Amino acid sequence: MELRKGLEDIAIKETSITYIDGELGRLYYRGYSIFDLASFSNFEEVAYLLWYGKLPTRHELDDFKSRLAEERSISEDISTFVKRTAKFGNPMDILRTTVSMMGLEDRSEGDLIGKAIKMTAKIPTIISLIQRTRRNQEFVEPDPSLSHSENFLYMIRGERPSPSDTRVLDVSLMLHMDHEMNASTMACLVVASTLSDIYSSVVAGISALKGPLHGGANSEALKQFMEIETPDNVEKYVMNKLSSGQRLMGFGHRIYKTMDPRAKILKEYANQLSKNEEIKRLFEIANRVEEIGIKILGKRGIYPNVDFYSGLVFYAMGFDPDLFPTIFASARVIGWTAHVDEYLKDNKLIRPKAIYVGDLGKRYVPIEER
Amino acid sequence: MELRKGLEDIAIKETSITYIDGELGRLYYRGYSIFDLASFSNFEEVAYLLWYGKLPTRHELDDFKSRLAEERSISEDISTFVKRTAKFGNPMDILRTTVSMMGLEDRSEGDLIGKAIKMTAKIPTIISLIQRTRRNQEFVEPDPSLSHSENFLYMIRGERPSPSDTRVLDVSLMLHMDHEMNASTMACLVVASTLSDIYSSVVAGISALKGPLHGGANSEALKQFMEIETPDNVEKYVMNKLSSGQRLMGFGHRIYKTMDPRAKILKEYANQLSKNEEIKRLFEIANRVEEIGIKILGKRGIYPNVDFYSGLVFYAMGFDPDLFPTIFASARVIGWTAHVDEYLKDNKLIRPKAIYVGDLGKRYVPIEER
């Protein structure tokens, strides 16, 4: 009878997957600090951790790396669809549609985690074919001898990347794998709660993640940096924005009351990129914007979010800005699917109510009297 | 903090669309009783009411009927996809994918209700192409001179239906158009709340409605009556089901604690259907299941819901059983889109939380030490 619009501070599940410490700027996956996983872990090891609940042994990780690598190919129907639509379609619409097709095409029963592994393996293949097609370049098929992040860069560039580029992509993807209960994870859980299949869940996740208010899954901050153009123009550009009551993009969180830990980590790993003159300039710009933003907005609890740096990092590695939401999905599908698996251990239908405003029992007025 | 798992009795929005009286078994659309609308309205008039918030004039309804009729065709790319997938694919996955394709191709801005009208006009064409393809029958194109429900039966059967058959389908569809904040409507709203597009919302609605604890139940209720096989076996089958703690399909509701008004109306209208020996038998079985279920489960507020008779009604009208959730969606899309339009007048991101019950501060052990 009290409205809880937006479900602010309403707990919909218990979890052991991800803990966010909003106050102190900390984030844990299955009890491990995101700082330590970024320092020492890798895409496949964290995907193992999130899905199976423990760090893998050497043998377990070797088997699991093989399993992912051998599930990367996409169907002819899907690849043809991507080629047809890459240049005209919204990339999140393309990804929504191709994961829907993937689900339609998979007639096997059960095996949530096996289907999660398929989606996680194949999404980069789809994203890469979008990017290659837009540039009038040929599809680069996945190379199952390569690890996840190395292969992802190989499929964009058509040649094997540097180990430093690979490492930066690997960390940037680990940083996006889960964030507890956001709108997209909630969409996945509403669908799963009906005992619909895991592809249907993920399709709803993608559908939610497209929306600009989701948070995190946009390149708005990168666009800002590009519009600033030169480091010497930062103070003036920011002045034009703040004076007119516009936000600095990449700042603010509903959750962290300090620097987002994912932003801190990306800023550090960005140093390890080799940068052409454009990227170096864009990082100088971003750093200056960050400095001014923190002086002005810091006291109001407004700090850089993960998407202050994420779009610039993905751009630096050769992705078009408007693919960035797809890349987010490529990592977050692991969290989505882990959350669904956890919930379904003790499922409950999600079925809220509304508060009704209006008269009841109106007389049906026949059409000739209206 | 309290776990509100399932969101039982949490209100997520203010609404003027649908009021459910769970204790007395009453249902209103914009304050008009479902019984009066079944008696005297029609698919197009109720759609108008739900989208535009008032009963149409004669002129307004005539224009709106034409507008729907003119938008029933589907693009060749979509029909090709349906024909290619219909024999082996799950119908709700086909429908999920086609709506996803429609959205991808419509990058036009705003016009939520215009897009809703398009989806509502085209979904029956898609469903009909699935059924015709599966039966190795030639596609029957929509006839713009026919109204919504007459046209739907014409496309399925390849023959113009009786006025009585038309009325039974038309009523059956009206009964499914909206039901306040059920799980599929909640999926649509979570997605809309991010400012994702209306097709993304509807794709998430389809994804949820598929599940057998939601719209998928209608197929499961008919499957239950077929499994019972003979009226004589009803008592034995039902008692074993209840002894073993298995659910009677098409019984119970999160809101109704009495007979669902939609079930009452379906049962009444089902009387006008001509029934061969198979259909007569299944109705006898259903009626007996209803009686024993009400006797035993009605004592604790568990009664037939809309899914109890809907599948049998659709089956009796010549639809394949696998299609019943798609037919649900063909009507519910109006309510989904109306709910989204209402919500977006004052949007708020839907972002709940989790309660963390795992470990924290675990030391990362490098792989060689595991």
XYZ file of C-alpha atoms in Angstrom:
740
model
C 0.000 0.000 0.000
C 3.070 2.245 0.163
C 4.395 2.811 -3.339
C 8.041 1.612 -3.793
C 8.607 3.170 -7.219
C 11.954 2.113 -8.721
C 12.344 -0.532 -5.941
C 14.816 1.756 -4.195
C 16.349 -0.164 -1.312
C 14.012 -3.196 -1.880
C 15.910 -6.488 -1.712
C 14.721 -9.004 -4.289
C 17.177 -11.834 -3.602
C 19.997 -13.024 -1.400
C 23.348 -13.388 -3.120
C 26.850 -14.684 -2.533
C 28.068 -13.589 -6.018
C 28.943 -9.894 -5.723
C 29.228 -7.452 -2.824
C 29.398 -3.694 -3.418
C 30.773 -1.460 -0.658
C 29.347 1.877 -1.829
C 30.797 3.784 1.113
C 34.380 2.687 0.760
C 34.570 2.067 -3.016
C 35.133 -1.711 -2.821
C 33.765 -4.590 -4.957
C 34.091 -8.352 -4.431
C 33.350 -11.358 -6.649
C 32.698 -14.507 -4.537
C 34.613 -12.811 -1.728
C 37.712 -11.883 -3.809
C 38.590 -8.186 -4.141
C 38.184 -6.810 -7.675
C 41.628 -5.206 -7.185
C 43.263 -8.630 -6.684
C 41.380 -10.219 -9.598
C 42.460 -7.334 -11.838
C 46.044 -7.660 -10.631
C 46.414 -11.391 -10.862
C 43.459 -13.113 -12.576
C 42.149 -13.439 -16.138
C 38.809 -13.502 -18.034
C 38.400 -17.289 -17.993
C 39.469 -17.717 -14.367
C 36.936 -15.102 -13.144
C 34.134 -16.573 -15.356
C 34.936 -19.934 -13.693
C 34.819 -18.303 -10.241
C 31.507 -16.586 -10.884
C 29.738 -19.671 -12.339
C 31.193 -22.448 -10.102
C 31.883 -20.547 -6.875
C 35.583 -21.306 -6.407
C 38.941 -20.597 -8.000
C 39.863 -23.376 -10.444
C 42.837 -25.705 -10.298
C 45.310 -25.677 -13.154
C 43.565 -28.702 -14.744
C 40.062 -27.312 -14.168
C 41.035 -23.988 -15.790
C 42.755 -25.698 -18.765
C 39.623 -27.788 -19.457
C 37.326 -24.733 -19.038
C 39.474 -22.488 -21.337
C 39.161 -25.248 -23.982
C 35.454 -25.542 -23.523
C 34.876 -21.806 -24.061
C 37.328 -21.594 -26.989
C 35.607 -24.482 -28.804
C 32.102 -22.842 -28.508
C 32.885 -19.516 -30.303
C 31.455 -20.228 -33.832
C 28.162 -18.736 -34.918
C 25.551 -20.224 -37.241
C 25.286 -19.289 -40.886
C 21.824 -17.793 -40.175
C 23.314 -15.542 -37.468
C 26.384 -14.521 -39.410
C 24.296 -13.700 -42.514
C 21.919 -11.648 -40.345
C 24.797 -9.666 -38.869
C 26.302 -8.925 -42.295
C 22.905 -7.785 -43.540
C 22.291 -5.415 -40.594
C 25.702 -4.278 -39.267
C 25.807 -0.970 -41.146
C 22.168 0.074 -40.541
C 21.041 -1.477 -37.266
C 21.549 -0.359 -33.694
C 24.218 -2.777 -32.455
C 22.257 -3.603 -29.277
C 19.265 -4.432 -31.517
C 21.527 -6.714 -33.529
C 22.818 -8.407 -30.381
C 19.229 -8.691 -28.943
C 18.103 -10.355 -32.195
C 21.104 -12.732 -32.571
C 20.971 -14.005 -28.958
C 17.229 -14.562 -29.577
C 18.179 -16.585 -32.687
C 20.819 -18.484 -30.731
C 18.125 -19.532 -28.198
C 15.699 -20.511 -30.990
C 18.437 -22.612 -32.608
C 19.422 -24.441 -29.371
C 16.962 -27.308 -28.966
C 18.921 -28.980 -26.076
C 17.180 -29.171 -22.617
C 18.437 -27.843 -19.249
C 22.187 -27.146 -18.861
C 21.950 -23.445 -17.827
C 25.720 -23.060 -17.396
C 26.488 -24.797 -20.738
C 24.147 -22.321 -22.511
C 25.761 -19.437 -20.544
C 29.164 -20.649 -21.826
C 27.866 -20.708 -25.406
C 26.542 -17.136 -25.186
C 29.740 -15.916 -23.518
C 31.874 -17.552 -26.229
C 29.793 -16.358 -29.158
C 28.921 -12.764 -28.297
C 32.459 -11.496 -29.178
C 32.192 -13.278 -32.516
C 28.972 -11.344 -33.283
C 30.398 -8.034 -32.085
C 33.578 -8.521 -34.149
C 31.553 -9.324 -37.324
C 29.509 -6.151 -36.783
C 32.723 -4.119 -36.524
C 34.519 -5.793 -39.491
C 31.374 -5.420 -41.681
C 31.044 -1.709 -40.900
C 34.677 -1.198 -42.033
C 34.162 -3.247 -45.243
C 36.478 -5.939 -43.823
C 36.090 -9.677 -44.011
C 34.843 -11.788 -41.140
C 37.760 -13.066 -39.080
C 36.662 -16.426 -37.701
C 37.499 -17.239 -34.090
C 40.809 -18.945 -33.397
C 40.273 -21.614 -30.732
C 44.021 -21.705 -29.916
C 43.730 -18.191 -28.509
C 42.428 -17.154 -25.090
C 39.224 -15.135 -24.836
C 40.613 -11.571 -24.852
C 43.457 -12.333 -27.318
C 40.914 -13.856 -29.704
C 38.522 -10.898 -29.340
C 41.242 -8.466 -30.492
C 42.323 -10.911 -33.242
C 38.784 -10.988 -34.640
C 38.657 -7.127 -34.794
C 42.173 -6.494 -36.121
C 42.733 -9.669 -38.183
C 46.141 -10.118 -36.569
C 47.202 -11.262 -33.121
C 47.474 -8.423 -30.593
C 50.321 -7.411 -28.272
C 50.266 -9.086 -24.812
C 49.846 -5.585 -23.210
C 46.735 -4.863 -25.360
C 45.373 -8.303 -24.497
C 45.911 -7.743 -20.790
C 44.119 -4.343 -20.837
C 41.098 -5.863 -22.636
C 41.096 -8.821 -20.231
C 40.978 -6.560 -17.160
C 38.418 -4.236 -18.726
C 36.085 -7.226 -19.382
C 36.611 -8.724 -15.837
C 35.583 -5.318 -14.416
C 32.174 -5.565 -16.203
C 31.255 -9.194 -15.382
C 28.905 -8.432 -12.494
C 27.549 -5.619 -10.346
C 24.878 -7.256 -8.135
C 21.338 -6.013 -8.781
C 21.076 -3.427 -11.534
C 18.093 -3.007 -13.917
C 19.455 -5.508 -16.490
C 20.102 -8.214 -13.881
C 16.568 -7.557 -12.575
C 15.125 -8.037 -16.131
C 16.957 -11.361 -16.389
C 15.578 -12.442 -12.985
C 11.945 -11.440 -13.734
C 12.055 -13.617 -16.869
C 13.835 -16.520 -15.092
C 11.274 -16.406 -12.247
C 8.597 -17.663 -14.706
C 10.838 -20.710 -15.532
C 11.486 -19.335 -18.985
C 14.795 -20.421 -20.501
C 18.205 -18.827 -19.933
C 18.407 -17.352 -23.486
C 15.048 -15.573 -22.872
C 16.595 -14.176 -19.624
C 19.684 -12.890 -21.380
C 17.598 -11.388 -24.221
C 15.720 -9.390 -21.576
C 19.068 -8.381 -19.966
C 20.282 -7.004 -23.325
C 16.945 -5.257 -23.898
C 17.338 -3.405 -20.501
C 21.083 -2.718 -20.862
C 20.395 -0.837 -24.160
C 18.554 1.914 -22.346
C 20.613 5.068 -21.631
C 19.420 5.295 -17.998
C 20.699 1.776 -17.092
C 24.057 3.307 -16.265
C 27.589 2.182 -17.143
C 26.809 0.933 -20.698
C 27.356 3.962 -22.852
C 30.276 6.011 -24.458
C 28.901 9.477 -23.443
C 32.088 10.409 -21.591
C 34.236 9.503 -24.595
C 32.077 11.723 -26.870
C 32.651 14.582 -24.353
C 36.435 14.046 -24.460
C 36.346 14.053 -28.291
C 34.277 17.321 -28.315
C 36.829 18.967 -25.934
C 39.479 18.092 -28.605
C 42.510 19.581 -26.824
C 43.661 19.438 -23.173
C 43.839 23.299 -23.033
C 40.112 23.457 -23.834
C 39.049 21.331 -20.811
C 38.343 24.165 -18.319
C 36.356 26.141 -20.928
C 34.292 23.148 -22.107
C 33.493 22.090 -18.550
C 32.523 25.721 -17.797
C 30.035 25.741 -20.712
C 28.489 22.503 -19.349
C 28.337 23.197 -15.597
C 27.195 26.829 -16.136
C 24.211 25.578 -18.167
C 23.288 22.874 -15.689
C 24.492 19.961 -17.951
C 26.265 17.025 -16.316
C 29.833 15.958 -16.806
C 29.446 12.572 -18.373
C 30.984 9.627 -16.543
C 30.335 11.101 -13.073
C 27.762 10.164 -10.503
C 26.619 6.890 -9.079
C 23.478 5.841 -7.399
C 25.864 3.493 -5.425
C 29.512 4.500 -4.924
C 30.063 7.475 -2.620
C 33.677 7.635 -3.713
C 35.712 6.802 -6.875
C 34.210 3.681 -8.491
C 36.866 0.952 -7.932
C 36.391 -0.181 -11.550
C 37.263 3.374 -12.687
C 40.400 3.419 -10.503
C 41.535 0.131 -12.004
C 40.837 1.143 -15.604
C 42.746 4.394 -15.106
C 45.805 2.418 -13.894
C 45.651 -0.196 -16.682
C 45.135 2.518 -19.320
C 48.759 3.580 -18.588
C 49.968 0.231 -20.045
C 48.316 0.972 -23.455
C 50.589 2.120 -26.228
C 48.782 5.150 -27.546
C 48.800 6.888 -30.880
C 48.673 10.661 -30.664
C 44.837 10.721 -30.619
C 44.564 8.340 -27.663
C 47.307 10.079 -25.670
C 45.490 13.412 -26.175
C 42.155 11.875 -25.203
C 43.622 10.453 -22.007
C 45.217 13.842 -21.106
C 41.741 15.375 -21.630
C 40.042 12.723 -19.489
C 42.544 13.121 -16.648
C 42.050 16.910 -16.593
C 38.268 16.533 -16.628
C 38.557 14.039 -13.778
C 40.701 16.503 -11.709
C 38.185 19.404 -12.109
C 35.185 17.148 -11.565
C 36.523 15.755 -8.361
C 37.257 19.289 -7.001
C 33.786 20.552 -7.844
C 31.514 17.542 -7.464
C 33.534 15.501 -4.894
C 31.960 17.218 -1.819
C 28.433 16.431 -3.193
C 29.459 12.696 -3.345
C 29.674 12.793 -7.202
C 32.769 10.856 -8.458
C 33.989 9.157 -11.666
C 31.999 6.036 -12.580
C 33.345 3.039 -14.546
C 32.047 4.596 -17.768
C 34.294 7.648 -17.374
C 37.251 5.562 -18.669
C 35.652 2.362 -20.159
C 34.579 3.841 -23.495
C 37.996 5.453 -24.046
C 39.798 2.150 -23.235
C 37.609 0.148 -25.679
C 38.058 2.886 -28.318
C 41.851 2.727 -27.753
C 41.760 -0.948 -28.579
C 39.954 -0.443 -31.895
C 36.227 -0.704 -31.198
C 33.743 1.903 -32.589
C 32.154 3.816 -29.692
C 28.660 2.722 -30.418
C 29.668 -0.977 -29.982
C 30.600 -0.243 -26.333
C 27.175 -1.358 -24.884
C 27.577 -4.696 -26.712
C 31.041 -5.166 -25.197
C 29.545 -4.463 -21.747
C 26.950 -7.214 -22.441
C 29.731 -9.592 -23.572
C 31.153 -9.511 -20.006
C 27.924 -8.933 -18.001
C 26.277 -12.068 -19.468
C 28.441 -14.030 -17.010
C 26.940 -12.159 -14.034
C 23.460 -12.256 -15.483
C 23.571 -15.997 -15.883
C 25.280 -16.599 -12.506
C 22.516 -14.567 -10.851
C 19.773 -16.559 -12.593
C 21.476 -19.911 -11.647
C 21.678 -18.799 -8.007
C 18.024 -17.577 -7.858
C 16.656 -20.754 -9.424
C 18.094 -22.846 -6.556
C 14.889 -21.659 -4.743
C 12.759 -19.934 -7.403
C 9.919 -17.555 -6.603
C 7.768 -15.835 -9.280
C 8.256 -12.084 -9.262
C 4.691 -10.627 -9.302
C 4.284 -7.172 -7.721
C 1.172 -4.927 -7.698
C 0.114 -1.407 -8.554
C -1.795 1.286 -6.626
C -4.969 1.974 -8.563
C -6.208 5.529 -9.195
C -9.720 5.890 -10.717
C -13.406 5.007 -10.698
C -14.584 1.426 -10.975
C -17.947 0.139 -12.222
C -18.378 2.643 -15.006
C -21.451 1.995 -17.154
C -20.612 0.721 -20.648
C -21.701 3.604 -22.919
C -22.842 2.274 -26.319
C -20.936 3.776 -29.222
C -23.847 5.852 -30.702
C -24.166 7.745 -27.333
C -20.450 8.795 -27.092
C 16.974 -5.498 6.024
C 13.981 -7.578 4.905
C 14.147 -9.923 1.919
C 11.078 -9.036 -0.349
C 11.638 -11.969 -2.651
C 8.841 -12.288 -5.254
C 7.708 -8.669 -4.499
C 4.474 -9.971 -2.966
C 2.350 -6.880 -2.096
C 4.965 -4.386 -3.212
C 3.407 -1.648 -5.369
C 5.766 -0.552 -8.159
C 3.577 2.054 -9.924
C 0.379 4.066 -9.758
C -2.019 2.937 -12.509
C -5.360 3.791 -14.079
C -5.365 0.855 -16.537
C -6.459 -2.310 -14.737
C -7.999 -2.975 -11.354
C -8.147 -6.543 -10.029
C -10.393 -7.432 -7.072
C -8.685 -10.618 -5.866
C -11.137 -11.318 -3.066
C -14.387 -10.877 -5.125
C -13.063 -11.964 -8.568
C -13.677 -8.728 -10.438
C -11.614 -7.191 -13.171
C -11.842 -3.720 -14.752
C -10.186 -2.042 -17.752
C -10.203 1.769 -17.295
C -13.121 1.246 -14.850
C -15.286 -0.873 -17.235
C -16.164 -4.339 -16.003
C -14.535 -7.214 -17.991
C -18.031 -8.805 -18.084
C -19.538 -5.814 -19.890
C -16.611 -5.629 -22.303
C -16.942 -9.360 -23.078
C -20.686 -8.850 -23.554
C -20.683 -5.790 -25.741
C -17.206 -4.614 -26.802
C -14.711 -5.938 -29.354
C -10.959 -6.360 -29.761
C -10.415 -3.033 -31.573
C -12.593 -1.017 -29.164
C -10.802 -2.374 -26.058
C -7.403 -1.830 -27.630
C -8.466 1.791 -28.257
C -9.662 2.144 -24.660
C -6.399 0.752 -23.271
C -4.128 2.867 -25.435
C -6.060 6.139 -25.582
C -7.870 6.082 -22.223
C -11.479 6.441 -23.389
C -14.087 4.575 -25.431
C -13.895 5.680 -29.097
C -16.575 7.429 -31.110
C -17.897 5.682 -34.211
C -15.564 7.776 -36.386
C -12.547 7.203 -34.117
C -13.157 3.386 -34.039
C -13.694 3.167 -37.805
C -10.378 5.069 -38.433
C -8.542 2.889 -35.843
C -9.917 -0.398 -37.254
C -8.579 0.670 -40.719
C -5.252 1.706 -39.281
C -4.762 -1.759 -37.699
C -6.053 -3.576 -40.768
C -3.585 -1.711 -43.021
C -0.543 -2.718 -40.896
C -1.005 -6.533 -40.794
C 1.569 -7.386 -43.513
C 5.071 -8.459 -42.587
C 8.320 -7.790 -44.547
C 9.666 -10.542 -46.777
C 12.775 -10.884 -44.586
C 10.552 -11.635 -41.573
C 8.286 -14.090 -43.419
C 11.320 -15.884 -44.840
C 12.737 -16.264 -41.297
C 9.436 -17.628 -39.946
C 9.094 -20.139 -42.811
C 12.684 -21.312 -42.271
C 12.215 -21.873 -38.481
C 8.562 -22.827 -38.005
C 8.831 -26.643 -38.311
C 11.530 -27.153 -35.639
C 11.501 -23.912 -33.581
C 9.686 -23.068 -30.334
C 6.847 -20.661 -31.370
C 7.495 -18.162 -28.564
C 11.215 -18.067 -29.549
C 10.170 -17.410 -33.161
C 7.823 -14.617 -32.022
C 10.514 -13.136 -29.667
C 12.926 -13.067 -32.582
C 10.478 -11.536 -35.113
C 9.464 -8.703 -32.776
C 13.190 -8.154 -32.186
C 13.645 -7.925 -35.992
C 10.709 -5.476 -36.333
C 12.334 -3.248 -33.768
C 15.743 -3.414 -35.424
C 14.161 -2.232 -38.745
C 12.126 0.619 -37.147
C 14.719 3.159 -35.961
C 12.046 5.995 -36.145
C 11.810 8.004 -32.914
C 8.965 8.148 -30.337
C 5.439 7.189 -31.481
C 5.077 4.469 -28.797
C 1.413 3.867 -29.583
C 2.091 3.802 -33.370
C 4.709 1.050 -32.811
C 2.319 -0.836 -30.460
C -0.346 -0.776 -33.198
C 2.108 -2.219 -35.654
C 3.136 -5.052 -33.336
C -0.510 -5.814 -32.470
C -1.520 -5.954 -36.183
C 1.467 -8.118 -37.296
C 1.729 -10.716 -34.497
C -1.341 -12.731 -35.721
C 0.171 -12.813 -39.215
C 3.360 -14.303 -37.765
C 1.457 -16.843 -35.653
C -0.640 -17.846 -38.656
C 2.495 -18.260 -40.854
C 4.012 -20.532 -38.158
C 0.887 -22.756 -38.012
C 0.385 -22.902 -41.818
C 4.084 -23.678 -42.365
C 4.043 -26.532 -39.781
C 1.008 -28.115 -41.418
C 2.596 -27.792 -44.925
C -0.155 -25.367 -45.933
C 0.147 -22.298 -48.118
C 0.232 -18.986 -46.280
C -3.085 -17.109 -46.278
C -2.407 -13.379 -46.377
C -4.364 -10.973 -44.141
C -7.628 -9.616 -45.568
C -7.892 -5.865 -44.722
C -11.670 -5.968 -45.153
C -11.957 -8.318 -42.131
C -11.802 -7.265 -38.510
C -9.009 -8.450 -36.184
C -10.453 -11.717 -34.850
C -12.277 -12.756 -38.044
C -9.034 -12.151 -39.972
C -7.002 -14.197 -37.435
C -9.251 -17.292 -37.883
C -9.310 -16.716 -41.680
C -5.455 -16.754 -41.806
C -5.243 -19.956 -39.650
C -8.050 -21.938 -41.293
C -7.888 -20.575 -44.867
C -11.641 -20.089 -44.713
C -13.815 -17.235 -43.355
C -15.091 -18.229 -39.878
C -18.663 -18.258 -38.516
C -19.722 -15.091 -36.619
C -20.028 -17.276 -33.456
C -16.410 -18.556 -33.796
C -15.248 -15.011 -34.416
C -17.025 -13.828 -31.253
C -15.484 -16.585 -29.086
C -11.942 -15.689 -30.306
C -12.635 -11.943 -29.949
C -13.815 -12.367 -26.386
C -10.933 -14.770 -25.565
C -8.437 -12.127 -26.798
C -10.114 -9.242 -24.893
C -9.806 -11.328 -21.719
C -6.004 -11.559 -22.149
C -5.249 -7.934 -23.033
C -4.148 -6.685 -19.531
C -3.761 -7.900 -16.029
C -1.937 -5.206 -14.041
C 1.597 -6.016 -12.793
C 2.055 -9.655 -13.693
C 5.612 -10.953 -14.334
C 5.597 -10.265 -18.085
C 4.294 -6.699 -17.621
C 7.009 -6.235 -14.931
C 9.693 -7.430 -17.398
C 8.406 -4.852 -19.966
C 8.485 -2.096 -17.306
C 12.011 -2.916 -16.019
C 13.264 -2.605 -19.592
C 11.217 0.563 -20.274
C 12.518 2.144 -17.039
C 16.047 2.320 -18.572
C 14.552 4.331 -21.489
C 15.084 1.354 -23.813
C 12.745 1.272 -26.861
C 9.234 -0.155 -26.889
C 10.198 -3.188 -29.015
C 12.896 -4.110 -26.421
C 10.132 -3.925 -23.760
C 7.815 -6.219 -25.703
C 10.679 -8.672 -26.484
C 11.239 -8.935 -22.670
C 7.471 -9.395 -22.137
C 7.450 -12.302 -24.636
C 10.551 -13.745 -22.917
C 8.745 -13.802 -19.546
C 5.315 -14.853 -20.792
C 6.840 -18.010 -22.329
C 7.605 -19.522 -18.961
C 5.272 -22.252 -17.650
C 4.732 -20.396 -14.313
C 3.212 -17.626 -16.518
C 1.688 -17.698 -20.007
C 3.237 -21.100 -20.808
C 0.753 -22.614 -18.318
C -2.078 -22.593 -20.880
C -0.308 -25.290 -22.976
C 0.450 -27.226 -19.745
C -3.311 -27.253 -18.700
C -4.393 -28.805 -22.031
C -1.454 -31.269 -21.824
C -2.803 -32.211 -18.326
C -6.298 -32.872 -19.706
C -4.810 -34.942 -22.548
C -2.690 -36.944 -20.036
C -5.793 -37.739 -17.958
C -7.172 -39.292 -21.221
C -10.648 -40.300 -19.825
C -13.217 -38.512 -17.561
C -13.279 -41.679 -15.426
C -9.611 -41.205 -14.599
C -9.986 -37.562 -13.340
C -10.466 -38.331 -9.646
C -7.571 -40.776 -9.490
C -5.224 -38.488 -11.491
C -6.034 -35.313 -9.467
C -5.853 -36.987 -6.038
C -2.381 -38.452 -6.852
C -1.262 -35.055 -8.070
C -2.335 -33.382 -4.809
C -1.088 -36.232 -2.530
C 2.358 -35.921 -4.163
C 2.426 -32.108 -3.792
C 2.417 -31.509 -7.600
C 0.451 -28.437 -8.899
C -2.888 -28.695 -10.734
C -2.182 -26.781 -13.971
C -4.356 -23.612 -14.492
C -5.159 -23.272 -10.710
C -4.024 -20.491 -8.402
C -3.142 -16.856 -8.761
C -0.992 -14.311 -6.912
C -3.969 -11.893 -6.758
C -7.250 -13.921 -7.193
C -8.327 -15.928 -4.159
C -11.603 -16.857 -5.882
C -12.679 -17.900 -9.392
C -10.852 -15.825 -12.026
C -13.533 -13.798 -13.893
C -11.707 -14.576 -17.133
C -12.030 -18.303 -16.474
C -15.769 -17.892 -15.831
C -16.229 -16.041 -19.126
C -14.108 -18.511 -21.159
C -16.115 -21.431 -19.729
C -19.382 -19.665 -20.672
C -18.270 -18.808 -24.235
C -16.719 -22.262 -24.791
C -20.380 -23.506 -24.905
C -20.894 -21.952 -28.341
C -18.004 -23.945 -29.882
C -18.862 -26.973 -31.998
C -16.986 -29.943 -30.583
C -15.882 -33.189 -32.288
C -15.533 -36.264 -30.101
C -11.924 -35.402 -29.003
C -12.865 -31.848 -28.002
C -16.054 -32.969 -26.214
C -14.022 -35.501 -24.188
C -11.348 -32.967 -23.197
C -14.094 -30.506 -22.036
C -15.668 -33.252 -19.946
C -12.226 -33.977 -18.398
C -11.589 -30.229 -17.808
C -14.986 -29.714 -16.188
C -14.409 -32.630 -13.808
C -10.902 -31.397 -12.921
C -12.455 -27.947 -12.252
C -15.077 -29.382 -9.893
C -12.634 -31.473 -7.821
C -10.049 -28.661 -7.784
C -12.529 -26.088 -6.512
C -13.819 -28.539 -3.865
C -10.315 -29.269 -2.481
C -8.126 -26.244 -3.320
C -10.857 -23.516 -3.307
C -11.033 -23.845 0.518
C -7.632 -22.088 0.647
C -8.197 -19.551 -2.158
C -6.804 -21.614 -5.072
C -9.211 -21.550 -8.019
C -9.112 -21.897 -11.842
C -7.287 -19.045 -13.552
C -7.390 -17.751 -17.172
C -5.024 -20.588 -18.275
C -7.384 -23.352 -17.246
C -9.806 -23.087 -20.210
C -7.871 -20.808 -22.664
C -5.790 -23.606 -24.252
C -8.764 -25.898 -24.747
C -10.709 -23.004 -26.340
C -7.841 -22.176 -28.754
C -7.368 -25.870 -29.550
C -11.112 -26.266 -30.228
C -10.873 -23.304 -32.691
C -8.082 -25.023 -34.702
C -4.829 -23.664 -33.209
C -1.926 -25.995 -32.553
C -1.236 -26.415 -28.735
C 2.326 -25.150 -28.956
C 0.891 -21.767 -30.074
C -1.207 -20.867 -27.021
C 1.454 -18.612 -25.402
C 1.878 -16.727 -28.695
C -1.869 -16.119 -28.851
C -1.693 -14.800 -25.223
C 1.098 -12.434 -26.301
C -0.955 -11.290 -29.373
C -3.474 -9.742 -26.924
C -1.194 -8.925 -23.933
C 1.053 -6.746 -26.086
C -1.701 -4.058 -25.851
C -1.536 -4.086 -22.039
C 2.236 -4.248 -21.948
C 2.577 -1.207 -24.220
C -0.199 0.676 -22.412
C 1.630 0.047 -19.081
C 4.887 1.312 -20.516
C 3.273 4.426 -21.917
C 1.629 5.138 -18.559
C 4.869 4.602 -16.590
C 6.964 6.785 -18.894
C 4.790 9.828 -18.096
C 6.985 9.973 -14.954
C 9.770 7.445 -15.417
C 11.916 6.034 -12.635
C 14.702 3.506 -13.136
C 13.850 0.162 -11.589
C 16.991 -0.703 -9.591
C 16.435 -3.004 -6.577
C 19.107 -4.502 -4.327
C 20.307 -7.838 -3.042
C 21.119 -8.935 0.503
C 24.687 -10.232 0.555
C 25.178 -13.549 2.380
C 28.616 -14.653 1.087
C 32.213 -14.242 2.169
C 34.448 -11.163 2.038
C 38.185 -10.443 2.032
C 39.362 -13.821 0.741
C 43.085 -13.980 -0.064
C 43.728 -14.607 -3.759
C 45.789 -17.774 -4.086
C 47.668 -17.979 -7.423
C 46.878 -21.032 -9.493
C 50.098 -22.961 -8.857
C 49.303 -22.955 -5.104
C 45.806 -24.475 -5.566
